Structures are given as C-alpha cells and as structure tokens.
Design a protein around this ligand. Structure first.
Ligand SMILES: CCCCCCCCCCC(CCCCCCCCCC)(CO[C@H]1O[C@@H](CO)[C@H](O[C@@H]2O[C@@H](CO)[C@H](O)[C@@H](O)[C@@H]2O)[C@@H](O)[C@@H]1O)CO[C@H]1O[C@@H](CO)[C@H](O[C@@H]2O[C@@H](CO)[C@H](O)[C@@H](O)[C@@H]2O)[C@@H](O)[C@H]1O
Ligand SMILES: CCCCC/C=C/C/C=C\C/C=C/C/C=C/CCCC(=O)O[C@H](COC(=O)CCCCCCCCCCCCCCCCC)COP(=O)(O)O[C@H]1[C@H](O)[C@H](O)[C@@H](O)[C@H](O)[C@H]1O
Ligand SMILES: CCCCCCCCCCCCCCCCCC(=O)O[C@@H](COC(=O)CCCCCCCCCCCCCCC)COP(=O)(O)OCC[N+](C)(C)C
Ligand SMILES: CCCCCCCCCCCCCCCCCC(=O)O[C@@H](COC(=O)CCCCCCCCCCCCCCC)COP(=O)(O)OC[C@H](O)CO
Ligand SMILES: CCCCCCCCCCCCCCCCCCCC(=O)O[C@H](COC(=O)CCCCCCCCCCCCCC)COP(=O)(O)OCCN
Lengths: 101, 488, 262, 70, 26, 60, 75, 90, 30, 126, 147
C-alpha cells in the first residue's frame, strides 16, 4: 500500500533519518525516556494496587495497572524518541551522535 | 509504516486501555476466589488513570498531530482546533469520572461496564472532533449516541431511568435519521463527501445563479439534526425528561461532553457549509427561541435537575448567538462560552452529586443549607451567580463577549433578547440563593459530607469562577488561536 | 511610596485573614476587621497628603493587562473628583464595623467579611479609568449588598426589598452594558483617556447618553425609579443603611461626573 | 511624583493606546473566510495524494492497463 | 408610588410571568 | 439484652477488625447487580442479633 | 512584586483548606497535603505563565499570516 | 426518468417512517420499525446516488450504516424489554 | 520478625519508590 | 410508648440537655432547654421553644406546651416565656457548640496509646 | 413496469406497517418492505447489497423484532439538479457508445467494495466494529437476570 510520512507542519529542528524504523527508535531511547517510562509504570502500578484493596484484589489490580502503565509509558517514550529523530522535538543529542557516524 | 500511526496513539491507547479494563472487570467480577467483588471503583480509578495517560500522550505530542496528513487525509484531519478541543474533552471526561466515584460506593452501583462505556464514548468523541468527512462524523455520532443510550437506562429497576433511556434512544435515532438524510441529499447533489471537496464545490456558487434545491435541503436537514443533538428549541422534545430521569452522574456527562464535540462538528460544517448564510438564519431563530424558552421555563421549576436542564438549554441558545454572527470574534465568543459553561456545569453537578447522597430532589430541600453547611451554600450561590452572569464572576465574561460579537455583526435584536433573558435568568437564579440563606424552614434536611474528589473539584472550580477576571488572558489567547486555525 | 495597589489590597488581606479564622474566636475577628478598616483609612489619608492639585492628569496610575491584546486593562487612577469619594468610602467602613460591635456574636465573620468585600469593591469603582471594568466593579456590589440585606434583615420583608433592588439594578446595568459595548466596537478601546479624545457623531451621542442615564438615574433616584430606595433603606441593618446612603447613592453622581458629562 | 515624568507617561500612554486601538480595529476588520483559503496547502491534499494512488487498481484509466504490457 | 408607579412597575402587573412561566408546559 | 452487650464487650482485636470489615461490606446493598450476576449476598451470622431483642421478634 | 510562585502557593493552600472545609473537617487536617498543594499551585501558576507567553506568540504569528493573506486581495 | 422514481420512492418511505414515529406515539414497537424504515430509505438514497454518479462512496457508507441500524435495533429492543418489566405495560 | 511477608505489598512499595525517584529525575533531568 | 406514638428518643436542633438528665423515649422539639436533674419518661413531648426548669420530672405521657416555663417534681406550669428568652434559646446551644469545638481540637485523629501497648508487650516479650 | 409494481407493493407494505393493529402483521409487512427493496437494489445491479439486505434486514433484525413481538405479549396497538428525460429513446437507444476497454477485466460489486473497504477506509470499518462491541456490551447490562 502507498504511504506518505510527510507532515503538514514542517520540522523546526534538524531532521535525521526522516522515517525511522521501530528497532532504531527503540534503540534511540535516552535516560530521560527511561525515566518517564519508569515513572508512568510505577504510578500506574501504585494506582492499581491502591484502588484494588477495597474489592479485595491487590495483585490482579496491580497487574492490570502495570500493563496499562507499560503500554502508555512505552508509547510515550516511543513518541518522544521518534519526534526527536524526525526533528519535531529538540534533538540535541541525536544530531551529535549521528554527525560523527 | 509504524510511524504513520504516531497520529493515533492517543486513540489507540484509550481503545486498548478500555479493552484491558473490560477484560479485567469481566474476569474478576465473575470470580469465586474473591466472592464476586464489586470492582466498580477499581475500574473507575484505572479508567481515570487511562484518561490521564492519554491526555499526556495527546498534549505532549503537539508537533506530531499533522504527521502523515496525506495518508490520513480521507479519514480524519488533525489541526490546532482539534488539538485543543480534544484536550478539553479529555479534561471534562476526567472530571466527570472523578465526580462519579462516590456514586459507586454509597448507592452501591457495582456495574463496571459504566466506566467502559464512558471510555468508549470518549473514544467516539475523539474520533468525532478530528472527523473531516460526513461518513466519519456520522459514525462517531452514532457510537457516542449508543454509548449514551446504554448508560441512560443503567438503573434497570428505576421507572425514570428506563423511560429516559427509551425517550433518549427514540429522539436520537430520529435526529440521526434526519441528519443522515441530509448527508445523502448533499452527496447526491455534489458527488463529494470530504469537507475540502465540499468546500471547493460550494464556495464559488453562492446561490449566485440559482438555489440548488438538493444542496439547500441537505444543509437544512443537517442543521436540524445537529440542533436536535444540542437540544435547541423547538428541538428539545424530551431533553428535560431525559435529564431528570437519567442518573445524576450520567446527567453530568451528557450535559458537558456531547456538546463540545457536536459544537466542533458544527464549526467544521460552517467552514464549508456557509451556503448563502442559510444556517445563520436558522441558528438566529433557534438561539432567540432557546434563550426565551429557557428563561421562561426555568422559573416554573421546583426540582433541581429540571432547572439545570433548562439552564443548559438557555446557555445553548446563548452560545448559538455566536453561530448566528459568523466572524472570528463570533466563533471566539462561542468557544469561550462553551468553556465557561462546561466549567460551571461541572461545578453545579458536583454540588448536586454531593447532596445526592441524601436524596435531594426539590429546591426547597436545600433550604437550611446555609446553617448546616455554610460553605457549600456559598459555593452553590457562587455557581448560581455565575450562571446568572453577575459581573464579578466568570459567567459574566462569556455573556459579555457573546453580546459584543452579536453587536459586531449588527444584530441589535439579538442583544435585546439576550438582555431580557439575562434578567429573567438572574431572577430565577437568585431565587435559589434566597432559599438557602433567607428562608427559615421548620424542618431541616442534614446532608452527609462529601469525599475528597468532589471537594477538590469544587474548590478548584470555585477559585476559577471568582478569580477568572483577574487573569483571563490565556483563555482569550487560545480561543483566538483556535478560531483562526479553523480556516488557516 | 503609597500607591493605589496597597489601598485596594488592604481590605483584600483583611477579608482573607478572617476567612480562615474559627468562628468561636469572636474577639479576634472583630479586632482584625477593625484594624484592617483603620489601616485602610490611614492609607487613604496618606494618599490625600501626596496628591498634586495643579495637574489635570490622573495621578498614581497603575496598569494590569486584562485582554491579551491590551485592548482593555485594569487602569487605576485618582483625580481631584474621586479622591474625597475614596477617602469617604474608606472612612465609613470602620464606623459600620463599630456599629455592630455589641451584637457581632450573632452575625459572625460573614458580616465583617461582607463589609470588607464591599470596601474593596467600592474603592476600585472610584479609581477605575476603564469604562468596561468600571461597569464590572460598578455592578459587583450587588452580591455583598444582596447578602447584607437578606441574611441580616429585620423582618420577613427582606426578601421583597432585595428582589426589587436587584431587579432595578440589573435593568439599569444591562442597558448600560449595551452602550458600553457599542462604544467599544466603534472606538476600539474602553480607556477613559481615549474615549475623552474621540469625536462621537451627534446622532450616537443622544442614544449613548440615554443608555448611560438609564443605569445612573436608578442609583441617583430622579423621580420614576425612587420607589426602591425607601424600602431598601428601611429594611436594612443600621450599618447597612450607612453604606446605601453614604456611598451607593454617590455612584450615580460620580458616574455622571466621570463619564456622561465629558 | 515628578511632574515631568507623569506628563510624559500620560502622553506616551495616549499615543501607544491610539496605535494599539487602530491595530485592533484593523484586526477586527479581518473576514472570517480569508481571501482564497482553498488555495492554501492545508486545504489542498487530494491534489498530492491522488497522483500517488493514481496507479492503484480501481482508479486507473481503462486504456492505462491495455498499454502497460509493453 | 403605591399606584401607577407600582402597578406598571415590577410587581403590580409585571408579575404576569407567573401567569406566563407556568404556561410553558404546553 | 445483657447477652449481646456481653458478647460485644469481650471481643478480641482480631475479631473486632473482621466484624468491622464485614459491617462495612454489607452496609449498602445492590439487588440489581446481584440478580444480574445470579448471586445472593446474605448477611453473615456475626451481624445478626437474636430475635429475642428485636422489637417484635422479626425472623425475616 | 507579586510573582507567579507566591500566588500559586497561596492558591494551592487555599484550595486545600477549602477542600478540608467543604468536608466539615478542620482546616489544617493533614499538614503534608497543604505543602503538596502549595507546591502544585506554584508549579501550575509558573506553567500557566510560560504557556501564556507562547500562546500569545503563536496568536501573533497566526494573525500576521491572516493579515498577509487578506492584504493580497488588493493585487 | 428513473432517478426521479428511485428518489421519490425513498422520500415516501422516509415520510412514512416519520408518520409512524409521530402517529404511533402510544406504541413503542412502531416507533422502532419506523426508524428502521427511515434508515432503509436513506440507505437506498445512498446506493442510488452511488450508482448514478459512478462513485463508490455511497456503497461503503450504506454498508457502514447497516451496522448502525442493526445496533440501534438491538439497543432499542433491549431498552423496550426492560421498560415493559418495570411498569408492567407499554 | 525483621521480614515484610506480603509479596504483593512489597512490590507496590518498590513501584512507589521507583515512581517517586523517576518523577524527581524527570523534574531534574528535564 | 404509652401514648402510642413511636418511642424513638429524638432530639431536634438547638436543644440543650442539662447535666444528669434521664431521657427515655421522649421527643424534644427544636429550640428547647432541659434543666439539670430533669427526667423525661416514656412518650413525653416537649414542644418547641420551651424551657424545662432544673430538677423537674414529668411522668410518662405528659406534654410541655410551647413557649412556657415548667418545673417541679410533678412538673407544673410556672410562667410564659418572653420573646427575648425564646430568641436567646438557640444562642445558648450555639455557645455550647463553640465550647465543644474548643474541646474538639485537643484530640488528634489517632491516639498514641498503641505505642504504650507495644512497650508493655516488649516488657513481657511479645 | 417492474419498477412501478416493485415500488407500489413496498409503499403499500410500509403504509400497512405504520397503520397496523396487530404488531405481528406490522412485522410481517415490515419484512415485505425489505423483500421489495432487495429487488429494487437488484434492478440497480447491486447484487451484493440485495443479498445483504436479505441476510441482515429480514434475516437478523426482522427475526429479532419477531421474537420480541411474539413471545412477549402479542398485545394490541426534480427540474433543478437532474431534469428528467422525456421518453425520446427510439434514436437515443441507437446513440449508445460502448467502451470495450472497461469490460476486458470487470470487477464485481463484491470485490470492488472489498478493494477499498479494508485498506483505504479501514478506520471507519474499525469504528463500526466498536459500535458492534458497544451493542454487545449493552445487550447484557440492560437484559440479564441469571439463576
Ligand atoms: C487568578 C489569580 C489572579 C492573579 C493575577 C493578578 C496578580 C498579578 C501577577 C500575575 C502574574 C502571574 C499570573 C498568576 C496566574 C494565576 C494562578 C493560576 C492558578 C495557579 C494555581 C503574570 O502577570 C504578568 O504576566 C505577563 C506574561 O509574561 C503579562 O505581561 C504581558 O506579557 C506579554 C505576552 O507575551 C504581553 O504581550 C505584554 O502586553 C505584557 O508584557 C501580564 O499577564 C502580566 O504582566 C505575575 O507575573 C509572573 O510571570 C512572569 C512575568 O511575566 C515572571 O517570570 C517571567 O518568566 C518569563 C516569562 O515566561 C520571563 O522570561 C521572565 O523574564 C519573567 O521573570 C514571574 O516572576 C511573575 O512576575
Ligand atoms: C525529620 C526530618 C524528615 C521529615 C520528613 C520525613 C519524611 C519521611 C520520608 C518519606 C515520606 C514518604 C512519603 C510517601 C507516602 C506515600 C503514601 C503512603 C502509601 C502507603 O499507604 O504505604 C503503603 C502503600 O504502598 C504503596 O502503594 C505506595 C507507597 C510507596 C511509597 C512508600 C515509600 C516510602 C519510603 C520513603 C523513603 C524513606 C527513606 C528513609 C527516610 C527516613 C530518614 C532516615 C502501605 O500500603 P497498605 O496496603 O499496607 O495500606 C494502605 C494505607 O493504609 C492507605 O493508603 C489506605 O487506607 C489503604 O487502602 C492502603 O492503601
Ligand atoms: C501481555 C499482553 C496483555 C495480556 C493481558 C491482556 C488482558 C488484560 C487482563 C488483565 C487482568 C488479568 C491480569 C492478570 C491477573 C493475574 C494477576 C497475577 O498474575 O498475580 C497474581 C499472583 O501472582 C503474583 O505473584 C503477584 C503478581 C503481581 C506483582 C507483579 C509485579 C507487578 C507487575 C506490574 C507491572 C508489570 C505488568 C505485568 C507483567 C507484564 C495475583 O496475586 P495474588 O493472587 O493476590 O497473591 C496471592 C496471595 N494472596 C491471595 C494471599 C494475596
Ligand atoms: C492520587 C492518588 C490516587 C490513588 C488512590 C486510588 C484509590 C483510593 C481509594 C478509594 C477507594 C477506597 O478504597 O476507599 C477507601 C478509602 O481509601 C483510602 O483510605 C486511601 C487510599 C489511598 C489514598 C492515599 C494513599 C497514598 C496515595 C497518595 C498518592 C501517592 C475506604 O477506606 P475506609 O474503609 O478505611 O473508610 C473509612 C475511614 O477510614 C474512616 O474515617
Ligand atoms: C483552577 C483555579 C485554581 C485552583 C487552584 C489550583 C491549585 C493547584 C491544585 C492544588 C491541589 C491541592 C490538593 C492537595 C493534594 C491532595 C491530593 C490527595 C488525594 C489523594 O490522596 O488521593 C485520594 C483521592 O484522590 C483525589 O482526590 C484526586 C482528585 C482529583 C480530582 C480531579 C481529577 C483531575 C480531573 C481533571 C481536572 C478537573 C477538570 C478540569 C477541566 C485520597 O483518598 P481519600 O483518603 O481522601 O479517601 C478516598 C477518597 N476517594
């Protein structure tokens, strides 16, 4: 199927590898991305544990909240990394890494 | 290929989270180890968390909303207007979910499918705001309509809830049929369903040579259907009955969320459907009639929820004033009014739900509230005055700027009707404040204190209402930015 | 340096402090309210001292943005006309507090808080140089006075008098607001210094003057709308009558002096 | 207050307020529909997508496939 | 005051809204 | 009547917590959801008083 | 002067004590969440100002584009 | 002239559906079958227009509106079933 | 008795500590 | 109750019950003052805006008319309350409420006695 | 001819639906309405849509309505857009140009629809899926009484 990745609003930062692959975006995760991933996951796990005590299911609610948090945090980190690579977010480190490449 | 879906993570996340919540609830509600736990509060908290996470996904990814716009062109169109409308919609949904937590415990509403259906309706409205086609708009409208029909009759044993659900479904299906006939008549006359094509084909021939009967009829039918959706008179067939019979946490959501998305659709229809200013006349008459009927009907109400319904109708007319005057400063007034009305409605429904634990039904029930809870009476009086439009409060700014927009286009008749309706509304709003503070009833009704969620929501909204005039710049800035982005 | 900001913030702090004080401590509430009123009065007296009496330009001007494009903004300034009104409206409040000293155990904190909010809203009325915000603080006084008339009335008639006063004030208010809107649309701003240098067409002067007269004549009763003043005056606490007769009847005259006549 | 500074501030305020007033009136003069908004790039998306999907089966000229053999 | 000004005022005859708001049930 | 007071004033800490949890769990009821689930939640015997202290000996 | 940090902190403390009052509890029921509310209010006020500046800049850019589009009508 | 007849038939079906919703306010079942008649008329409009204009945007829409009509039938009949149980009458 | 026995509650404590530390780092690193 | 009315002991708003008062199935209407050593037996009604003198006893089924002062061991009519007394009746309840609120701030939500229990247990092992 | 009778019968059936005493007869005529609409669609060449109307309308919705009516109570109760062409076809029929290029490889109404229903407009397809899921969920919560 024919696809197009061009965006209506152009990128305001240098663009490296305009259409990155999934594996490369995942391999571009920085310390901040892992921090926000872990923060979202931990918040979700804690909310699930606290909310499930009254019904009586702490572990099941913990796991459900953990799944929600993992999915949300991973997609947030992927969004940030892809935006940085594609030039929509400040890619201070990306240009430094891929210039010497 | 995976990066083309960067434009739909906020919707993919909420869909998948709703699926996970449904699986969790159905697996553990029908369980023997845990003795069939009533996990409605658990699912509610996890749904609120999911709403907050998709808000984080949507708000942070602002530059990425236009990504792959050519690929997604025929499906939906995302822009600055859609971004802010969707963020506001998620905020309102989160507020409603926060309010309805106490409903699940004191009244023992153990059905977790309520939260799942709310999340699905939220997904439908997210797809509604970004819808740039007649097909997508209709499908999203139907999805949210079904999600609301199901939850309107959630109280199966209640006589009011079943009748309210039946009337809501019949009215909504009839309105959907009218709107859908209008869409068919437009498609059969122009051959196009996309909004860009339907704008290019109608912007030139502004009834300059002749009036296309098919196009005019389709536009009129779409306008009539949308007017049924927002319940603007004489298309308010059963709206007060639906609001009264519906559960109070349900009534809170239908009074806010279905209006933001439908108004977004009406705006994205005005961007192309301005055929000879036909809708401007229809919305002119509808707004005048809505203000007049709401003002004259809310004075003959003794129940709190019917008065809230008629207040909603009157504010819908006040907002449609902005539709009647097509200008950047008219659409901006419309959006400011929508925002302020949504916040006031959330405040009022949180107050009502706070008193609903003691089964409040009549205005006379809240008679000695100034003695038992002398701060809740102050908060409710502030909300009522904000509805009235007293200058110092935040409700005055919306009516002020709407009247300014109305006078800008030169419609002096709208201003006089708005002024008279404002006087009548202020009278029947201060009537409630009279009951709380000035009357001395023989028998008092003592209410139990509310929980933390509604207390925080009331505190934040009351600080917003009183102190909005001091710093109103961000709202005006974002509203002016949204109004301009509707075309460029 | 004594400016108009501190004079307006003093009643604000006075009302905020009493807002979070337990009602059992009746002595502390009265002392703090009286002290705040006296400090505001002394602040006004100091503002009199540094008042230049040789310039027609507005003095002690302060600005705060209201609209994002600076179209309308909080412009505060005093002249030789509104200085004594500010001094009087800050002097009357401590007297009103002292009137209800003995019986304050029954009214509570909401009495002094209402009077302090009244003072805060009336100081800004005489200091505003923006036509629209002069209306915002012009008709914000209704809520505190509505509460004062209704909650602490004498007999059961307090409901009727409050309704009559509120209804007449609304009828004047919105008909003046329409004129303010028409001026804003045509002129482009609502600044008094700009509205006093704009040549209005002869036809529009009569309509705008009549619309302004509609709101002001109610608050300075001429003849046909003087039927709310006696009932509101009689059905009011002793201190409440002082506010209605001492200040609230000076809004119409000041409104005529400041906006209509120029 | 210094008499010179007060008068200078008053005159500057009047002057800048008049300029801002003119700017805001011209702002209000803007029409809701800009001059030829269909000419904008955001409103011209079918002109760039259809050429990319021009050769897809279901959109081809009937004589197109008869000549793609050679 | 008590007569023409009141009857033509806000409550002598302007209280017909009670005879007007209650009719909205139609 | 003295018997229920005697049986209530001599409970241990562990029994008091369990009874408080049960009392909270069965304070409010939802017959609709129970019927939809096909279950019938019944009040535990720890929250049932003997019929000899009820106003007229109410078994149901 | 009046900075966003102090007005935010005051608003956070006020909303915390307002929530406590609305539930018939003492004003300073839980002292730690008062500090939490002060911090959140300060953060929200600072973020609101930072967002307002950018919002005004974007509005100026959009209005410049609209005026440029309108001005071309005269050619 | 065949497009005129195809449009007139569906317009009459739509009018009959509206009449059934209006006239049969006492009965609930007729108020559902009339809605289904209206949906049928609109689907016929979309299909006829798609064939007339030689465009596939009416057939896709007819297929997608079939789902909405069926789901509305399901929800409406469930609501009616629970409605009769409570009040014991229609 | 120097052992916390509830495994599920221990994991919640670990998750809360991780969330607090990550939030602090997020507010500091960016 | 002997009168046939429900025997729930119900006390309405702004009711001051003096010390050493024995209430049994009595119903007290709002804004009443009950004196010390007062005994209200089964099915006795105290009408609103009335004051019962200290040390007064009323047998079952007796009623105190509204707006009157009653006292004595076989409680009898004394006089009729004036307006000032029947309007200061709720002010006494408000003052006692203020005193109770003053007492209310001396106690935290949780006591610290469990630490003493733990210390006592440690002194004996576990 | 065939169009006129196939429309007249459907009009009469719909009129009987909206004006029927016994709801069973109303549902039976409600079936005939779609029975005629399927033939009308077949006259347009939309063979797939007529078969789906038989499958869906009078195969699932009509059966459901019949179930609800029966076991429950059986209780009692032009010149502007497209100006029409006058009958001048003796010469017009001869003026019929056929392009053989579009007939060498012709798609059916089924595969023509499926070519773009699942790839170029798949989001609407998933939205209809979500609507069906909403109907499934709402069927239980409204109507469910176990044991
Ligand atoms: C409801 C309470 C009512 C209180 C309002 C009255 C009290 C007055 C204080 C209002 C207040 C806080 C807003 C409170 C928010 C409410 C809380 C919300 C809920 C919280 C729980 C904003 O007030 C100022 O904000 C300015 C915006 O910058 C605006 O000036 C206009 O801007 C142009 C636009 O571009 C216009 O074009 C132009 O015409 C005006 O120049 C004006 O709004 C006003 O001057 C105080 O100012 C605070 O923000 C800024 C100063 O700017 C300060 O830090 C700044 O940071 C960088 C800028 O990001 C700068 O680089 C940096 O240099 C600077 O140091 C702060 O230290 C503090 O001083
Ligand atoms: C005097 C100067 C200082 C002065 C300042 C002193 C500061 C003291 C230092 C840190 C203060 C920490 C504040 C953080 C507080 C968070 C809220 C406490 C959360 C908490 O209930 O605890 C855990 C929960 O577990 C987590 O789900 C989430 C809990 C994760 C967070 C717990 C991690 C705490 C470790 C903190 C690091 C300590 C490092 C050493 C600190 C001491 C310094 C030596 C216990 O669960 P639980 O099932 O037995 O019971 C809970 C509990 O009863 C209530 O929340 C509910 O009623 C109930 O439903 C149930 O949820
Ligand atoms: C992978 C794709 C998504 C797959 C699922 C999709 C559908 C969603 C379904 C969600 C609902 C079911 C979720 C799993 C339910 C089973 C939960 C579980 O495995 O834990 C068990 C038991 O397993 C455990 O050991 C606890 C595991 C929870 C703690 C695990 C660490 C937290 C993980 C959250 C973040 C990671 C996400 C989950 C791993 C991917 C629950 O513990 P308890 O039975 O209460 O403990 C027994 C003791 N006592 C009854 C006395 C309390
Ligand atoms: C933002 C944080 C959101 C995470 C908390 C979500 C779940 C909150 C629990 C609400 C549902 C519930 O279980 O109700 C319980 C209430 O929930 C709680 O008690 C608190 C739950 C945890 C909330 C705060 C703990 C730490 C979370 C702070 C953020 C980290 C009932 O408690 P109770 O039976 O003891 O009530 C009687 C009362 O004790 C007598 O006065
Ligand atoms: C805007 C004008 C300016 C206003 C001032 C703003 C100042 C900044 C905000 C200051 C907030 C200060 C609050 C102090 C922190 C206390 C938070 C503790 C809450 C908590 O512990 O979690 C449980 C409840 O969660 C909760 O209580 C969470 C409640 C959240 C409600 C709203 C959720 C977000 C909705 C989106 C925004 C609202 C709509 C806006 C459009 C408590 O549990 P418990 O022990 O009390 O017992 C069970 C009750 N459930």
């Amino acid at each position: 199927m024919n696809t197009d990745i061009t965006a209506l609003e152009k990128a305001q930062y240098p663009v490296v590898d305009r259409n990155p692959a999934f594996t490369k975006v995942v391999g571009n995760f920085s310390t901040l991305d892992y921090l926000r991933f872990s923060t979202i996951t931990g918040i979700s796990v804690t909310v699930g544990y606290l909310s499930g005590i009254k019904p009586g299911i702490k572990g099941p609610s913990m796991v459900t909240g953990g799944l929600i948090g993992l999915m949300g945090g991973f997609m947030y980190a992927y969004q940030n990394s892809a935006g940085r690579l594609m030039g929509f977010f400040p890619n201070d480190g990306e240009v430094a890494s891929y210039q010497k490449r | 290929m995976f990066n083309l879906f960067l434009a739909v993570f906020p919707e993919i996340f909420i869909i998948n989270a709703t699926f996970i919540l449904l699986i969790h609830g159905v697996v553990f509600s029908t369980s023997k180890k845990y003795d069939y736990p009533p996990l409605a509060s658990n699912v509610g908290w996890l749904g609120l968390l999911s709403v907050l996470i998709t808000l984080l996904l949507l708000a942070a990814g602002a530059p990425l909303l236009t990504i792959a716009h050519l690929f997604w062109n025929n499906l939906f169109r995302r822009d600055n207007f859609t971004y802010f409308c969707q963020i506001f919609l998620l905020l309102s949904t989160a507020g409603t979910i926060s309010m309805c937590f106490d409903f699940f415990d004191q009244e023992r509403f153990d059905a977790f499918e309520f939260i799942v259906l709310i999340l699905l309706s939220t997904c439908g409205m997210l797809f509604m705001i970004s819808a740039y086609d007649l097909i997508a708009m209709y499908l999203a409208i139907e999805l949210q309509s079904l999600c609301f029909y199901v939850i309107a009759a959630s109280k199966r044993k209640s006589e009011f809830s079943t009748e309210a659900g039946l009337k809501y479904l019949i009215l909504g299906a009839f309105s959907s049929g009218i709107l859908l006939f209008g869409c068919s008549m437009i498609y059969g006359s122009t051959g196009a369903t996309h909004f860009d094509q339907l704008a290019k084909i109608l912007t030139g021939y502004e009834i300059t040579g002749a009036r296309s009967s098919g196009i005019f009829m389709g536009i009129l039918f779409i306008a009539v259907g949308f007017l049924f959706k927002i319940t603007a008179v004489p298309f308010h067939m059963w709206a007060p009955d639906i609001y009264e019979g519906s559960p109070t946490p349900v009534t809170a959501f239908l009074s806010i969320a279905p209006k933001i998305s439908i108004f977004a659709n009406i705006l994205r229809v005005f961007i192309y459907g301005s055929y000879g200013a036909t809708l401007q006349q229809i919305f002119f008459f509808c707004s005048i009639a809505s203000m007049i009927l709401g003002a004259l009907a809310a004075m003959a109400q003794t129940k709190v929820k019917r008065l809230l319904a008629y207040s909603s109708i009157g504010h819908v007319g006040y907002i449609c004033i902005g539709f009647s005057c097509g200008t950047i400063e008219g659409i901006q007034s419309l959006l400011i009014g929508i925002f302020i009305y949504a916040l006031m409605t959330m405040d009022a429904f949180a107050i009502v739900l706070a008193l609903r634990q003691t089964r409040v039904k009549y205005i006379a029930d809240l008679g000695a509230l100034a003695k038992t809870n002398p701060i809740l009476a102050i908060t409710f009086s502030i909300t009522m005055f904000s509805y009235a439009g007293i200058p110092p409060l935040a409700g005055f700014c919306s009516k002020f700027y709407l009247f300014f927009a109305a006078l800008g286009c030169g419609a002096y008749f709208l201003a006089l009707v708005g002024v008279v309706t404002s006087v009548i509304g202020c009278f029947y709003y201060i009537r409630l404040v009279k009951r709380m503070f000035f009357d001395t009833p023989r028998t008092w009704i003592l209410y139990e204190p509310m929980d933390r969620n509604k207390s925080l929501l009331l505190a934040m909204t009351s600080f917003f209402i009183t102190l909005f005039l001091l710093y109103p710049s961000p709202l005006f800035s974002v509203t002016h930015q949204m109004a301009l982005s509707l075309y460029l | 340096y004594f400016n108009l900001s501190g004079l307006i913030l003093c009643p604000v702090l006075g009302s905020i402090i009493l807002l979070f004080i337990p009602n059992s401590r009746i002595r502390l509430i009265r002392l703090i309210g009286l002290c705040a009123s006296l400090i505001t009065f002394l602040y006004s007296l100091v503002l009199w001292i540094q008042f230049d009496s040789s310039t027609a330009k507005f003095q002690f001007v302060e600005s705060l943005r209201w609209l994002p494009y600076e179209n309308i903004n909080f412009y505060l300034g005093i002249d030789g006309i509104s200085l004594f009104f500010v001094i009087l409206t800050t002097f009357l409040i401590p007297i009103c507090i002292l009137v209800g000293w003995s019986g304050m155990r029954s009214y509570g904190k909401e009495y002094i808080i209402a009077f302090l909010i009244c003072e805060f809203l009336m100081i800004a009325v005489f200091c505003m140089l923006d036509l629209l915000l002069f209306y915002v603080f012009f008709e914000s006084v209704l809520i505190p006075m509505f509460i004062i008339i209704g909650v602490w009335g004498s007999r059961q008639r307090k409901i009727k008098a409050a309704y009559q006063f509120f209804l007449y004030t609304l009828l004047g208010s919105l008909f003046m607001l329409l004129a303010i809107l028409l001026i804003l649309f045509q002129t482009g701003t609502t600044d008094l210094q700009i509205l006093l240098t704009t040549e209005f067409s002869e036809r529009r002067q009569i309509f705008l003057w009549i619309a302004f007269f509609a709101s002001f004549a109610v608050k300075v009763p001429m003849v046909p709308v003087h039927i709310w003043l006696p009932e509101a005056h009689v059905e009011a606490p002793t201190a409440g009558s002082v506010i209605l007769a001492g200040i609230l009847l000076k809004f119409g005259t000041y409104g005529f002096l400041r906006f209509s006549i120029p | 207050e210094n008499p010179e500074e007060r008068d200078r501030k008053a005159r500057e305020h009047i002057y800048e307020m008049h300029e801002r007033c003119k700017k805001i009136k011209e702002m209000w003069a803007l029409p809701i529909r800009p001059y030829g908004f269909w000419t904008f790039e955001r409103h011209n998306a079918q002109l760039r997508w259809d050429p990319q999907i021009s050769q897809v089966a279901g959109r081809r000229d009937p004589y197109d496939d008869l000549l793609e053999d050679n | 005051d008590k007569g023409a000004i009141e009857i033509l005022g806000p409550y002598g005859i302007s209280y017909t809204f009670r005879r007007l708001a209650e009719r909205i049930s139609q | 009547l003295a018997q229920i007071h005697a049986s209530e004033n001599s409970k241990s800490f562990e029994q008091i917590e369990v009874e408080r949890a049960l009392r909270k769990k069965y304070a409010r009821k939802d017959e609709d959801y129970d019927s939809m689930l096909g279950i019938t939640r019944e009040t535990p015997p720890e929250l049932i008083l003997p019929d000899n202290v009820l106003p007229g000996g109410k078994p149901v | 002067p009046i900075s966003a940090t102090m007005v935010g902190a005051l608003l956070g403390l006020g909303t915390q004590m307002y929530s406590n009052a609305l539930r018939k509890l003492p004003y300073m029921r839980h002292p730690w969440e008062h500090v939490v509310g002060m911090g959140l209010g300060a953060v929200f006020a600072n973020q609101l100002v930072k967002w307002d500046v950018k919002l005004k800049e974007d509005l100026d850019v959009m209005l410049a584009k609209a005026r440029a589009a309108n001005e071309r009508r005269y050619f | 002239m065949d497009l005129i007849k195809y449009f007139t038939f569906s317009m009459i079906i739509f009018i009959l559906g509206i009449w059934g919703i209006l006239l049969n306010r006492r009965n609930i079942l007729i108020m559902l079958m009339s809605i289904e008649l209206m949906l049928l008329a609109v689907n016929l409009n979309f299909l006829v227009f798609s064939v007339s204009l030689d465009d596939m945007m009416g057939q896709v829409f007819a297929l997608l509106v079939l789902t909405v009509a069926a789901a509305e039938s399901a929800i409406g009949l469930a609501i009616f079933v629970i409605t009769f149980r409570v009040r014991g009458t229609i | 008795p120097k052992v916390s026995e509830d495994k599920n509650r221990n994991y919640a404590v670990v998750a809360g500590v991780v969330a607090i530390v990550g939030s602090i780092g997020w507010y500091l690193k960016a | 109750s002997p009168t046939g009315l429900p025997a729930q002991t119900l006390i309405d708003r702004y009711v001051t019950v003096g010390a050493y008062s024995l209430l049994r199935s009595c119903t007290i209407e709002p804004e009443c003052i009950i004196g010390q050593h007062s005994i209200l037996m089964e099915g006795s009604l105290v009408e609103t805006r009335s004051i019962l003198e200290a040390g007064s006893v009323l047998p079952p089924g007796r009623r105190i008319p509204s707006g009157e002062l009653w006292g004595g061991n076989p409680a009898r009519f004394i006089r009729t309350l004036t307006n000032e007394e029947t309007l200061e009746i709720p002010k006494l309840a408000v003052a006692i409420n203020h005193l109770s609120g003053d007492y209310f701030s001396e106690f935290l939500p949780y006591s610290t006695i469990y630490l003493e229990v733990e210390k006592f247990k440690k002194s004996l092992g576990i | 001819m065939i169009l006129s009778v196939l429309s007249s019968l459907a009009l009469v059936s719909g009129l009987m639906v909206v004006r029927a005493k016994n709801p069973v007869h109303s549902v039976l005529f409600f079936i005939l309405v779609f029975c005629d609409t399927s033939g009308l669609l077949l006259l347009l060449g939309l063979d797939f849509f007529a078969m789906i109307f038989l499958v869906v309308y009078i195969g699932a919705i009509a059966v459901l309505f019949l179930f609800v009516v029966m076991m429950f109570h059986i209780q009692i109760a032009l010149d502007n857009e497209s100006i029409p062409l006058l009958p001048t076809q003796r010469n017009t029929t001869s003026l019929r140009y056929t392009v053989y290029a579009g007939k060498v490889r012709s798609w059916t109404n089924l595969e023509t629809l499926g070519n773009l229903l699942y790839t170029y407009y798949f989001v609407w397809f998933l939205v209809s899926s979500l609507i069906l899921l909403v109907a499934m969920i709402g069927a239980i919560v409204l109507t469910m009484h176990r044991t």
